[PDB]
């Protein structure tokens, strides 16, 4: 009878903090995903570790 | 863990009821033996806890700890008797069985052998 006080809360924040953190982090990422033309440069690093492949792969 | 063997007792009781309580005991036989398989399964003891986890990791502690302090105070009785002087009306049902047949069994058997004397003629 204890436990089955406890665990309950326990559970609750855990799937509360989990539908926090979706929830959240879809708003983010669906707000800020823009800036990339901003800094292209997120691609000119693509370019940069990419000659880094296009040379060193190989 | 409850009972025991005493004398020799679950088989040598059922077939021997004092007429007194004679009827009742053949009806106690089957009842008891549901309750010695039965205590015999139960858990004696759960654990108890690892305060550990929950205390840290279950962070609204303020709560935990409380009802944890709570628990950890409490204290706890046995259960209760009430049919056990049966087991002293015993040592009554004891002397009644003895002394009262044996004594005047005694006697009587002191009789039939003094008697058994001539009649072997």
């Known amino acids: 009878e204890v436990k089955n006080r406890l665990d309950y809360h326990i559970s609750v924040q855990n799937m509360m903090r989990q539908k926090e953190q979706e929830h959240m982090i879809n708003w983010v990422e669906k707000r800020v995903v823009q800036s990339i033309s901003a800094q292209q440069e997120k691609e000119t690093i693509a370019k940069c570790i990419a000659d880094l492949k296009l040379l060193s792969k190989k | ?121």
């Open chain 2, 1 to 121: 863990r409850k009972l025991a063997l005493k004398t020799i007792d679950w088989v040598a009781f059922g077939e021997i009821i004092p007429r007194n309580q004679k009827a009742v005991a053949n009806s106690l036989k089957s009842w008891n033996e549901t309750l010695t398989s039965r205590l015999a399964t139960l858990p004696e003891k759960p654990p108890a806890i690892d305060w550990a986890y929950y205390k840290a990791n279950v962070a609204k502690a303020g709560l935990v700890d409380d009802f944890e302090k709570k628990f950890n105070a409490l204290k706890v009785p046995i259960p209760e008797d009430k049919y056990t002087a049966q087991v002293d009306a015993e040592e009554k049902e004891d002397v009644k069985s003895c002394a009262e047949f044996l004594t005047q069994s005694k006697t009587r058997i002191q009789e039939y052998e003094k008697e058994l004397e001539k009649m072997r003629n």
